[PDB]
Amino acid sequence: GSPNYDKWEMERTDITMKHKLGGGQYGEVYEGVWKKYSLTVAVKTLKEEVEEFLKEAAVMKEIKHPNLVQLLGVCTREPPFYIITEFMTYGNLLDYLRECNRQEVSAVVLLYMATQISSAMEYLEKKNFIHRDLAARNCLVGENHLVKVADFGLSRLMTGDTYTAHAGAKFPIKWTAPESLAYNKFSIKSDVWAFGVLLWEIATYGMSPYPGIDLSQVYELLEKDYRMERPEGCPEKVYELMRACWQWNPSDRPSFAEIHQAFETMFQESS
Ligand SMILES: COc1ccccc1-c1c[nH]c2ncc(-c3cncc(C(=O)N(C)C)c3)cc12
């Protein structure tokens, strides 16, 4: 209602900062509390660069989905900058899977998780956005196994079909598509490749990918058509989808729209 009104800007003193969450595992991301609504929130901040932060904030102002961690506000009028998002009480999926009782987090739950994530990614796909760091460590868990994709530091709205990373830029090798590793070319399809790896993390309940292989041999192995083996207890149809996500030719990988209806159907069939 006033000249400098901005629907996302919050007054920093409105937020109580507590401690760095995820054991510093995510950088300057802290648990905090939004006093006025007595709400626990996650708050990412900056030290004393900024283009990246502003871009991340900008991206979050544009995406909204049940399975994408929701932006609640920002503090970007002056240092220190804040990106304020809802808090997911159970932390990240990688840790959640590694420490769970497997009769509780059963076969049907694994399908539920994949379905939620693929739903978030179908939404990004349709909006022509790419995530660029899909992995179990970047998904979050809420009540009743609610799962949400998080960490949009590398996300961006694409103008065309690919985005070329600057170079000298290093990536999380084990989750990176061949074309991305070799030519820094990212796209929705490179996110689909990462989703396939994420599915393997879900099927193994949090195991590190490419067991025993040196990060250095990864690309050569993929080039020979080596792919991770079917995890013990992973249904054949799920592994099939895994292999499809890892098709060498990006155009040969399924779309997230396809992946999602495939998972939603398997999820329902296991009621
Ligand atoms: C990927 O998450 C992020 C990456 C970058 C910026 C923000 C987040 C983020 C937003 N909401 C969150 N909620 C919980 C945790 C969270 C994850 N893992 C462990 C904890 C934890 O320590 N607790 C207290 C459960 C919390 C992390 C986030």
Q: What CATH number did the domain enclosing 222 receive?
A: 1.10.510.10
Say if residue 5 is in the same domain as residue 117.
no
Q: Are 64 and 70 in contact (CB under 8 A)?
A: yes
CA angle 55, 182, 203 (to 5 degrees): 75
Count how many Cα atoms sit within 13 Å of the Cα of residue 99 in the half-sphere of its side chain: 8
CA 248/CA 271 separation, integer angstroms: 34
Q: What CATH number did the domain enclosing 20 receive?
A: 3.30.200.20
Task: Dig out the tokens for 100 from the structure.
Answer: 């769970």
Q: By alpha-carbon position, which residue is closest to atom 5 of ligand 1?
A: 151
The strand pairing partners of 148, in sequence order, are 140
Question: Quick one: DSSP state of residue 14?
Answer: G
Q: Is 110 annotated as a binding residue?
A: no
Say if residue 82 is in the same domain as residue 180.
no
Task: Output b/e per residue, 164-184; b: 16+ Cβ within 10 A.
Answer: eeeeeeebbebbbbbbbbeeb
Dihedral over Cα of 189, 195, 200, 201: its sign: positive
> Of 54, 70, 87, which residue constitutes the final position of a domain?
87
Residue in 55, 253, 45 with CA at minimum distance from that of residue 152: 55
Whether residue 21 has its Cβ less than 6 Å from ligand 1:
yes
Query: How many structural domains does the chain have?
Result: 2
- Tell me how the structure was determined: X-ray
CA 156/CA 161 separation, integer angstroms: 12
CA 9/CA 81 separation, integer angstroms: 10
Q: Is 129 annotated as a binding residue?
A: no
Q: By alpha-carbon position, which residue is closest to atom 4 of ligand 1?
A: 151
| Residues with catalytic function | 133
